Design a protein around this ligand. Structure first.
Ligand code: GNP
Ligand code: MG
Ligand code: MG
Ligand code: MG
Ligand code: MG
Ligand code: MG
Ligand code: ZN
Lengths: 122, 338, 176, 102, 209, 38
RNA sequence: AGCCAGGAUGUUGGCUUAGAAGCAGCCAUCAUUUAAAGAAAGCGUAAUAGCUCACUGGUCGAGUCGGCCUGCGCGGAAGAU
RNA sequence: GAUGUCGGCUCAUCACAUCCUGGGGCUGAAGUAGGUCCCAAGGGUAUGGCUGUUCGCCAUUUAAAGUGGUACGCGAGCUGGGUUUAGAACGUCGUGAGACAGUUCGGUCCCUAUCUGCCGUGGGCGCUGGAGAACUGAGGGGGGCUGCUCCUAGUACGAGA
């Protein structure tokens, strides 16, 4: 799963490269973040010319998980690497203009169409 | 709902915490030392500017806003918690004035701007903070510094885009009913409205403007003795100042004289309102059933000599209401300076 | 006590039966029966009903006068009847009666249905007007309170249900 | 519904004065839809009004939208009409998010 | 109405037309035969005593043999009582089939869960294991404190510690039934039921909404 | 409504009543005068 | 105490007053026919209106009103196995 | 004549002077959201950085991150960071031995459960001839939390927000 103090990659071109999931949203005693969830991240590595800087705190949406995603027919969607899309703090909207890599269909269920629309895969 | 300025507020900063004179005694240590936690910092009252608000109706009762007492310093080096900040919701453009040698602390500029009005009291140091070689068992305690007792006056100017100026016989209040749904008091007697009221004209979802009606003024209003000229202070912010003139007034019977009497005190309020592009329209058209209506309109328009575009409307129902609003909004677009 | 010093008189065509401490005032407008407190006595006499207490009771005349009040309303309800007036004020407020049930629409998300007692009837001369007809003043008062409790008026606009003669407070409230 | 919702959506957007209507026939490049419509919004209130208009007519048409995203912010709002995604966005958002790639 | 009593044979998934896999539990039910019917006059409450399966004649002793012979029923694995619902009636010796569960669409399954033996505090009551390092000595899965100081001076009843876990009656409520088979005597119920394979299960219509 | 040990007729339209063994004040004119804990 | 009625006449008293007709401000607060009416206490109207009050008449018919002293009670009265 | 102290971990229990959820009164309660008071203890009641810290400040969530009692609950359940016997050093005091409710580095936490208690599981006997089953229920225990979205409805309210 995805929990606090977890190194995270980025699935967008916002400017970050490595972030830290350090707080997961959703309710009290929230232990894990699934494939579609709102999490709080801190930038650990970013391009100096990018739209975001080092140490910034903002919201992210999970895209890919190591453990996988359980389909209603006992099918898992595993991945090699954990990635997220960065969002503005006040409004949950994508910051990056593109998505790099595959995205699961589960984001469609939770009404995340910004990531699904401009993603050149599933 | 309605627009009322000149709100007053009393705010007090949270008093600083109080330290405690306590000593530490343990199982094998009869002489442990002065162990008394310091107090907590007092609460702080803040100011916040929101775009949504445009009135001070919530502060015409001048409630007393309390920042909670700072938590007293507890024994065993337990520091008291600071009181939570108190934030008061304030519109944009308000003036902040103190009672007694008061000055403008700050002017609201944009949404989210924060202004400090009263800083909380400092915490009271416990006996842990006063031990030394001279005195090894400090019994002295310091009271927290008191909070700031301050009187606040809030002055707000009108945020409307269109302001009305006309005689009490003119249908200023009833024109709001024709252009919006605000339901102000309308009757056949002078000085029906006592305070300015707001109104929003939304003919399309994308575009809209705010229009406010202002209480009527008389010949003698210039020097005073009536409602004064103080209600024209809520102007100079409107992009356009619509002017209503009552054709063939029932009790006036002097259309030529009273048409230009508005400009008389308009040129004498503070700076003649910088001669902003005030229009000129007539009302009570339905009273004149036929061609006599606009026949007199040109007769009374040539007396002023302005000769610019004039609109013949009746505030009772339609008849130019639906087309004058578009032209008012058209003027708004090319001029974005407020 | 001193109210009970004035005995009541029953009109013509009213039958009164005493079977111990139970009083029946059955007549033109239905049949009703009430049990007493076992401490106040009513004596059969000429066309007039009197009340008195029992010796050795602390309350004495204090509670005897109570029966003089309730029995007074009993003869009124069996000859003249009891009328209760309730009116609806506010948009989206409608009232209708279907048999022994009043249909209510008071801005809720579901219709409101009320079941009436056996001896209570209601009429709707207007969509915002309900009139209650009954034989006992206590029963209609409870029914009127039940209707009122759903939408007790607020003092800002007066929306809700109210009695015809009831006056409600009006507040010129302006803040927030 | 197929090949008819393409004209149905364009009619509804043009009914409320949409500008620069473009239809992308993404038959196989994307694995979620069959065609896409992108339209411009003059102002923030206009974008919300366009989005509400297309959703409301869809319910009367007989198709429930799967969801919308740009509710709080009117910079870019999407409507999921099943096989068709319709994007209506402001003047600025059509250049920062360049939707000619698909 | 009443339920049935049967035996769990295993668990299997069911594939729907849309591809959704429904994991179900397969319960075989033999045609239960009523051995007694109770009445208010004799016992003061209405219930029917049923039996299922078959039992070997040698194992069956005389006392229950007369019990079965009185009702005209052969030997059975066990006996159970189901409470009636104020209007339903059964007769002695009537066989109970399974097709009556074609409308309940919600069943309650009761059975003896698996026996885990003497279980520790961590396994039974889901306690928190203490630290395995930082100097900890001989105390990892121990319960820890079990009370306060001398002011209570005792251990309260119902305190959570180690003991026998499982091997007791467990009820799982509001279980969806998927399919019922009459000619094969199978009942497909969605979810997992208590007990091991081959254990006796009691299925009843759901009492909640 | 205010609940306090000391209860008195604040205005001329305040009636003192004993309900369920406690002292209460009912104001027919306006409900600000309601008291308890007499 | 309830109930049924009356409760004005110069007079919108003078001034400031857009409006002060009793009840936003000050003033005198006298004086007319009456069983009684105060340019007057409260609600309401910007102000007129519209409700009361002080006070009077009629039915009803026997105790009513408010101060003291004293006995016994009520609330005030929330803590941890 | 003795490890027994503060903090932390595990395990909790009780009171209500109620933090949230629940039911209301008043309001200077248009609505959402708030202010104060009454009833209500069924359930729930945060993660990290700093410091040994309880407490606090900070960052970010939640409906909330309640106040207290229980040898400031709990070391024959654990930890030994604080303090601290024996070592050493700095500042100060004293000629000095040394000292300092001054600081810094390091520094042994024993017990196989007799009784009450509690968690489970059995043997004996009784229930009036014996035995095998199946049940009613006198009583006892467990559980009772709540966020978000949609319809109602952009409806009531509100000039609009
Ligand atoms: N037939 C007709 N009567 C009108 C029209 N406009 C006004 N009136 C009449 O003239 C009266 C003038 O009063 P009103 O419009 O309320 O004036 P106002 O705008 O409130 N001015 P102020 O606030 O200063 O009193 C109205 O009450 C109405 O009887 C009109 O267009 N047609
Ligand atoms: Mg006006
Ligand atoms: Mg529509
Ligand atoms: Mg919206
Ligand atoms: Mg809106
Ligand atoms: Mg909404
Ligand atoms: Zn009162």
């Amino acid at each position: 799963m995805i929990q606090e103090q977890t190194m995270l990659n980025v699935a967008d071109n916002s400017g970050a490269r490595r972030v830290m999931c350090i707080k997961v949203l959703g309710g009290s005693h929230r232990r894990y973040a699934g494939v579609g969830d709102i999490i709080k991240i801190t930038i650990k590595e970013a391009i100096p010319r990018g739209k975001v800087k080092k140490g910034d705190v903002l919201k992210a949406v999970v895209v890919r998980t190591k453990k996988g995603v359980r389909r209603p027919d006992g099918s898992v969607i595993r991945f090699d690497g954990n990635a997220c899309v960065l969002l503005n703090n006040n409004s949950e909207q994508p910051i990056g203009t593109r998505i790099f890599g595959p995205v699961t269909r589960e984001l469609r269920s939770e009404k995340f169409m910004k990531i699904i629309s401009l993603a050149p895969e599933v | 709902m309605k627009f009322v300025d000149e709100a007053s507020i009393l705010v007090v900063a949270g008093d600083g915490g109080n330290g405690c004179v306590s000593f530490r005694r343990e199982k094998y240590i009869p002489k442990g030392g002065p162990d008394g936690g310091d107090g907590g910092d007092g609460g702080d009252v803040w100011m916040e500017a929101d775009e949504n608000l445009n009135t001070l109706i919530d502060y015409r009762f001048e409630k007393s806003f309390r920042a909670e007492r700072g938590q007293n310093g507890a024994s065993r080096d337990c520091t008291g918690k600071r009181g939570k900040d108190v934030t008061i919701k304030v519109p944009v453009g308000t003036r902040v004035i103190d009672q007694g040698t008061g000055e403008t602390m700050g002017d609201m500029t944009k949404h989210g701007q924060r202004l400090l009005v009263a800083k909380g009291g400092w915490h009271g140091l416990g006996n842990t903070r006063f031990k030394s070689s001279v005195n090894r068992t400090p019994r002295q305690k310091t009271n927290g510094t008191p909070g700031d007792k301050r009187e606040l006056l809030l002055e707000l100017m009108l945020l409307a885009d269109v302001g009305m100026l006309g005689m009490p016989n003119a249908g200023k209040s009833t024109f709001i009913r024709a252009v919006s749904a605000a339901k102000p008091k309308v009757a056949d007697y002078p000085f029906t409205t006592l305070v300015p009221s707001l109104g929003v004209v939304r003919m399309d979802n994308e575009k809209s403007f705010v229009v406010a009606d202002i209480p009527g003024l008389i010949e003698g209003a210039a020097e005073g003795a009536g409602l004064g000229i103080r209600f024209l202070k809520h102007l100079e912010r409107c992009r356009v100042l619509l002017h209503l003139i009552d054709i063939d007034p029932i009790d006036g019977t002097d259309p030529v004289e009273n048409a230009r009497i508005i400009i008389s005190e308009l040129e004498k309020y503070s700076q003649d309102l910088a001669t902003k592009p005030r229009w000129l329209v007539f009302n009570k058209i339905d009273l004149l059933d036929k061609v006599e209506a606009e026949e007199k309109a040109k007769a009374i328009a040539e007396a002023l000599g302005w000769e610019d575009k004039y609109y013949l409307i009746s505030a009772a129902s339609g008849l130019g209401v639906k087309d004058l609003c578009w032209d008012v909004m058209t003027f708004i677009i090319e001029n974005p300076v407020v | 006590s001193r109210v009970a010093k004035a005995p009541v008189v029953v009109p013509a065509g009213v039958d009164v039966k005493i079977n111990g401490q139970v009083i029946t005032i059955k007549g033109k407008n239905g049949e009703l029966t009430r049990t007493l407190n076992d401490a106040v006595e009513v004596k059969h006499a000429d066309n007039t009903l009197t009340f008195g207490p029992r010796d050795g009771y602390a309350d004495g005349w204090a509670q005897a006068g109570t029966a003089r009040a309730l029995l007074n309303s009993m003869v009124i309800g069996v000859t003249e009847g009891f009328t209760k007036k309730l009116q609806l004020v506010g948009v989206g407020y409608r009232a209708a009666v279907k048999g022994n049930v009043i249909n209510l629409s008071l801005g809720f998300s579901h219709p409101v249905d009320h079941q009436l007692p056996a001896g209570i009837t209601a009429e709707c001369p207007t969509q915002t007007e309900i009139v209650l007809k009954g034989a006992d003043k206590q029963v209609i008062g409870q029914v009127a309170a039940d209707l009122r409790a759903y939408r007790r008026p607020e003092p800002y606009k007066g929306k809700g249900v109210r009695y015809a003669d009831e006056v409600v407070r009006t507040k010129e409230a302006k803040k927030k | 519904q197929g090949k008819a919702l393409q004209d149905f959506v364009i009619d509804k957007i043009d009914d409320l004065k949409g500008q620069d209507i473009i239809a992308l026939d993404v038959q196989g490049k994307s694995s979620i839809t069959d065609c896409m419509i992108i339209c411009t919004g003059t102002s923030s209130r206009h974008v919300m009004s366009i989005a509400d208009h297309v959703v409301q007519e869809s319910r009367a048409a007989g198709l429930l939208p799967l969801g919308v995203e740009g509710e709080n912010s009117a910079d870019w709002i999407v409507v999921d009409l099943g096989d068709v995604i319709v994007h209506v966005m402001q003047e600025e958002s059509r250049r920062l998010y360049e939707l000619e790639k698909l | 109405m009443i339920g049935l009593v049967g035996k769990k044979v295993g668990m299997t998934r069911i594939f729907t037309e849309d591809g959704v896999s429904i994991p179900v539990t397969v319960i075989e039910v033999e045609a239960n035969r009523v051995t007694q019917v109770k009445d208010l006059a004799n016992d003061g409450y209405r219930a029917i005593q049923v039996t299922t399966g078959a039992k070997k004649a040698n194992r069956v002793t005389k006392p229950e043999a007369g019990h079965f012979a009185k009702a005209g029923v052969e030997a059975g694995r066990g006996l159970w009582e189901f409470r009636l619902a104020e209007g339903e009636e059964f007769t002695v010796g009537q066989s109970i089939s399974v097709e009556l569960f074609a409308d309940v669409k919600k069943v309650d399954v009761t059975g003896t869960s698996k026996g885990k033996g003497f279980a520790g505090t961590v396994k039974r009551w889901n306690f928190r294991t203490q630290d395995a390092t930082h100097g900890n000595s001989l105390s990892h899965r121990v319960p820890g404190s079990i009370g306060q100081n001398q002011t209570p001076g005792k251990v309260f009843k119902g305190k959570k510690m180690a003991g026998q876990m499982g091997n007791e009656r467990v009820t799982v409520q509001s279980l969806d039934v998927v399919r019922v088979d009459a000619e094969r005597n199978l009942l497909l119920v969605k979810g997992a039921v208590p007990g091991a394979t081959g254990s006796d299960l009691i299925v009843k219509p759901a009492v909640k909404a | 409504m205010k609940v306090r040990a000391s209860v008195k007729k604040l205005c001329r339209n305040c009636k003192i009543v004993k309900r369920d063994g406690v002292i209460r004040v009912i104001c027919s004119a306006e409900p600000k005068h309601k008291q308890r804990q007499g």
